[PDB]
Design a protein around this ligand. Sequence first.
Ligand code: NA
Length: 240
Amino acid sequence: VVGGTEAQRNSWPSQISLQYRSGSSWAHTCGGTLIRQNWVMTAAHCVDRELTFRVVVGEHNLNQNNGTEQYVGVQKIVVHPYWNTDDVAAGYDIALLRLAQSVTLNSYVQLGVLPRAGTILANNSPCYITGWGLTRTNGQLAQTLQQAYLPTVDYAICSSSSYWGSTVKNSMVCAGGDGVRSGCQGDSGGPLHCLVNGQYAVHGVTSFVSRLGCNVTRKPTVFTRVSAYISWINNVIASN
Ligand code: NA
């Protein structure tokens, strides 16, 4: 997250860190959302590589023990069957991870609330992105979880020529684009949290930013629209 602030430790308890095994070590690579005690929602592109992945729930500081972390292996990966890694602009950038164990819920670990199917946010709706991604273009991962206020940019503006044009689809949500605040690498797969009727729900799965940079004016961060995928998610969980 570029232009973020440090989140409080219990603000976003559905946020997870997706990590891969790297020699003797684990490395953060992506965000996700805990949506069942044994299921995580992330981006398909996050699991393109044939790696050993684990999920950390209750994480805050990636390089310090917080005393609240639970570490759980990924046992099964279900990628959206229409996802194409060499065509992120087509969409379908979504994947479900079944965990080897069910995690325990507490003030640091909770299920994300998903919007109702078909829900479309009005332009300029209030949302926050969260994650441990780069804090500058071509920078480095955050140590502690960051958040940034990213209001939505509706499809008619986002698919306009000076924004993303044909690259953005209605199966996506755009947010931000102010040139200062943005998602960045390492935030991919995590949540976009939007306040509706008093309650935060996870409306987006972070998918992509501009090849020119993370915080580019009129290139808002682009998210998979969760409310396009409610039946897909339910079908996968029901079948696994
Ligand atoms: Na930690």
